[PDB]
mmCIF file of C-alpha atoms in Angstrom:
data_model
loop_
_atom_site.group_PDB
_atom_site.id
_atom_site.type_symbol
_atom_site.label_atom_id
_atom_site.label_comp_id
_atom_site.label_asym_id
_atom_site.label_seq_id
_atom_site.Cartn_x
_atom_site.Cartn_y
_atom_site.Cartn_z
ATOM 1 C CA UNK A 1 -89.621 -59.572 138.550
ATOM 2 C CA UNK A 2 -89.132 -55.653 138.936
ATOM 3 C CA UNK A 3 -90.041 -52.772 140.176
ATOM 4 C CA UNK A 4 -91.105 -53.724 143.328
ATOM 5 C CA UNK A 5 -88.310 -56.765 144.324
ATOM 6 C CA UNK A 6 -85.878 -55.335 147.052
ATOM 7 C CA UNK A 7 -82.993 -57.272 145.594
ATOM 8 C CA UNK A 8 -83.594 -55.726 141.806
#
């Protein structure tokens, strides 16, 4: 999930 995903 988010943060940390580089596609959120």
């Amino acid at each position: 999930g988010c943060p940390x995903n580089p596609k959120c």
